[PDB]
């Protein structure tokens, strides 16, 4: 049995009920800090959120609640962007804990989703999301913004994932109060 850098849901993604507004590409990036995960298409922002307060949701951003029911397989480009914004939110929330007792040159930041982790050119972890067979697949790879042994890559992805989820073998990206993508590291059976 071999390992990999892939985490993915063990079941088909349930239908994603998404709210929407009309208008943006920079807006979706910024509002991902607070918990609003959206994708910009047909001049609209189709988004999910973890904010369980309509007034605060409006203040951060009319909002068509539950306006669409996306199937990710038929709308891979929607689900991928929403998932990436949710992942960025998760990492942003954990950044304060991560950067507690580390040197100022050894502090993680966000620049897919890239965590520029060690700057000299900086080496970091890049995240990619693919929808396949109505399932979500997340890839984390060591990148430079070069060629290293497999061990120095495995131990790098392990650090980045452990400092996000606390366990290397899973990660939970929350899309909304009712939808949470639970991904598990996949061990490709020989």
């Amino acid at each position: 049995v071999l390992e990999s850098n892939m985490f993915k849901t063990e079941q088909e993604l349930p239908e994603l009920i998404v709210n929407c507004i009309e208008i943006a590409h920079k807006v979706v990036k910024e509002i991902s800090k607070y918990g609003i995960f959206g994708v910009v298409r047909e001049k609209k922002i189709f988004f999910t959120t973890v904010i369980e307060d309509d007034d605060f949701l409006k203040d951060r951003l009319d909002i068509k609640k539950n306006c669409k029911k996306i199937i990710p397989e038929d709308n891979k480009d929607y689900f991928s962007q929403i998932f990436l914004n949710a992942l960025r939110y998760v990492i942003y929330q954990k950044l304060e804990d991560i950067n507690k007792d580390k040197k100022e040159n050894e502090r993680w930041t966000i620049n897919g989703v890239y965590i520029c982790k060690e700057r000299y050119i900086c080496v970091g972890a890049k995240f990619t999301i693919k929808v396949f067979d109505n399932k979500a697949e997340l890839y984390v790879d060591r990148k430079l913004k070069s060629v290293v042994e497999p061990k120095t890559r495995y131990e790098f992805i392990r650090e980045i994932i452990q400092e996000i989820s606390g366990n290397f073998d899973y990660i939970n990206i929350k899309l909304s109060k009712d939808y949470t993508v639970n991904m598990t590291r996949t061990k490709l059976n020989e």
Binding site: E3, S4, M6
Partner: protein
């Protein structure tokens, strides 16, 4: 299992040589000699070179390729000397005839070409000339007897570095063999039965026209079809090119192909699907492969080593949401990890039947080795895509496209 890994060794795929000599290593052309060879009448035309470059030219094309006193060792099953002995073909080169040209490049080369005396015309020049005037030269000499073979000054200089002197000569004698009208090898056609006669059309885009490089399952017969486009091939263009390819296949073989394999660098489009099912109806099976030379996958090994995974590892994931009776055709996905093949490959398979994924993996590996430029590790790619793209590149310079069907693979290779 729907998502697993396996090992597909190169020994299961093969290439053929004289008298049905089979081995998985293309570089063993030196052992079993070219499958169907010809005679090489060489013409070397050094362009803007200093003395040392001319001594290097004589060293390479005269002492290493002709003189038996210069006992050059060859990669595998070597005896000595040069082309005429190891390959068993008639190699003729006169070092006193080397032409000195002070370069307008194409005209200067052309005045120095003698098609009545020579089959091959090696052109030696620095990297800038070998890049600006490679495809232009290949196109400008379509239909002529002489086929050109470019060699840079840098490769000649590397003949002094010992290790490079022991690896460069073969990936130029094999190309000389190919450009003389010879066949270094043909693909082991037996590989296309684990996948479950046919075509292997590769789709490229001359940036505009669509290029379909059609070929048999052993790469013995080849033909380019060029269809203007008014990336994906529209329905009308794909229908036309498929009809033309099937006509050629029936002309050469005598029947329509029972299985059409297609290669692209983009996912199958709706128009391509409609055209495929319109020309092929429901009787002829089709496999379509969207291939990328990159993969986000990064598979790691166990802790008893430094997380190293044996080369040849292939990751199969069969899409369960597949049903060909309602327009759903994306069958599976194959990730060929590789260090030989320099790049990893990801293959989105579309299929009208239960196409075996390791079958298409073997297709892609046998099409990697099918390339006659398989030596020179850097240039290792899928054959049909590679030469479809070569034809796409040189089509920008061909004027009378009506000659495209007559063009040979050796005029682009």
């Amino acid at each position: 299992m729907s998502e697993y890994a396996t090992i597909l060794p190169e020994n299961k795929i093969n290439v053929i040589f004289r008298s049905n000599n089979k081995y998985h290593v293309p570089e063993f052309i030196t052992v079993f000699k070219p499958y169907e060879g010809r005679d090489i009448n060489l013409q070397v035309l050094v362009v803007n070179g200093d003395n040392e470059i001319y001594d290097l030219t004589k060293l390479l094309f005269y002492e290493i390729y002709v003189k038996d006193d210069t006992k050059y060792p060859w990669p595998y099953t070597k005896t000595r000397g040069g082309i005429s002995r190891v390959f068993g073909i008639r190699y003729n080169f006169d070092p006193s005839t080397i032409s000195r040209i002070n370069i307008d490049f194409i005209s200067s080369i052309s005045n120095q070409l003698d098609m009545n005396r020579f089959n091959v015309a090696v052109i030696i020049a620095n990297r800038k000339l070998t890049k600006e005037f490679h495809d232009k030269t290949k196109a400008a000499l379509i239909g002529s007897r002489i086929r050109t073979q470019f060699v840079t000054f840098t490769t000649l200089k590397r003949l002094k570095n010992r290790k490079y002197k022991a690896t460069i000569p073969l990936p130029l004698a094999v190309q000389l063999i190919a450009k003389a009208g010879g066949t270094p090898w043909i693909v082991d056609s037996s590989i296309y039965n684990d996948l479950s006669n046919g075509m292997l059309m590769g789709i490229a885009f001359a940036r505009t026209y669509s290029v379909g490089y059609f070929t048999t399952l052993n790469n013995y017969y080849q033909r380019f079809d060029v269809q203007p486009i008014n990336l994906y091939v529209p329905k009308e263009a794909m229908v036309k090119t498929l009809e033309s390819g099937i006509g050629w296949y029936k002309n050469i073989i005598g029947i329509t192909p029972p299985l059409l394999i297609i290669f692209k660098t983009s996912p199958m489009h709706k128009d391509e699907k409609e055209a495929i099912e319109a020309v092929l109806g429901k009787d002829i099976k089709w496999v379509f492969i969207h291939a990328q030379y990159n993969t986000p996958v990064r598979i790691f090994g166990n802790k008893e080593d430094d997380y190293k995974v044996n080369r040849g590892t292939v990751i199969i994931k069969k899409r369960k949401r597949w049903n060909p009776n309602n327009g759903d055709y994306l069958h599976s996905e194959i990730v060929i990890t590789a260090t030989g093949t320099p790049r990893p490959i990801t293959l989105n398979v579309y299929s009208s039947f239960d196409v075996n994924p390791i079958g298409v993996a073997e297709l892609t590996l046998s099409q990697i080795k099918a390339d006659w430029e398989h030596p020179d590790i850097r240039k290792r790619k899928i054959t049909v895509l590679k030469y479809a793209n070569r034809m796409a590149k040189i089509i920008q310079y061909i004027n009378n496209l009506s000659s495209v069907p007559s063009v040979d693979v050796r005029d682009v290779l």
